């Protein structure tokens, strides 16, 4: 159960989380990369903060994708991936 | 140790994390928070992935801050510690 | 759009209230009767006071309705209808 | 005029209700908190539906407060506010 941390407004991302939790799915993956991931952390928080704590942060994982830039640019951008699990 | 990641260039940062190792540092601590935490991460692959080959993530805590915003109104942002070992 | 609210947990119906608005919702109408009169303002309160800071209340109706109780006598219970707006 | 609605029987509130409208006032407030709320409501409904119609509803308010527990504890709960008037 993952959920793809964007552009979007924070909330669209935690909600996902929540009904993702709510609709059973034990455990969960936040994933972004590059300026999204600080958006992700934010979302694990609000969701652990704000909605269930007791939820637990399992793992974080951090590494480094290629990535192709729409003018042909290939460059390393780093990614994170957030568990989270009741 | 520690290596708090602001917004100077990414260069000092992990400059000043391969120095930190580099004098037999049991483990640098690198922080961030908000849209810094995006550089933290950047700059503990730029340093495991690129100058010292092999470091290890001993650890990443994800936290959130209390803050007084600016009008004296309620604020906080999210936290991020990434620990690497040689 | 509107959230019939039940004796599922609270958190349930804020959920989908905040869903409901989250895809851009003109405006959610939380529904309840007899004593779950209660958990509709829990849920608004909640709402409003906690998760999506802001909201507004644009209005708030009660009313009675008539049942079919059981062994076939006259029976009704009293309604509440709020209208949440972003 | 303010009426209080607790747990004694919903008839001792309403004809508080109608003995307050009947001692001239002209608009009366009805309040309750927690599990109370609905029986608020059902006064308010059994005055206009079974003793004055033509009362009407002129507001119905909702907030919250902290209450403390003869335990300790301190915890939001839900209010309401109904406003009849003539």
Redesign the interface.
Known sequence: HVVYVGNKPV??YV?AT??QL?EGADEVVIKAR?????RA??V??IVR???MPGVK?KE?K???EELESEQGRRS?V?T?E?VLAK
Not at 34 to 38: M, Q, T, Y
Request: without cysteine; hydrophobic residues 50%; aromatic residues 4%.
């Open positions: 909330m669209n909600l929540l009904t709510n590059g300026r999204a991931i600080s952390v934010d694990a928080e903060n704000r909605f942060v974080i951090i590494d480094t390393n780093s994170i957030i």
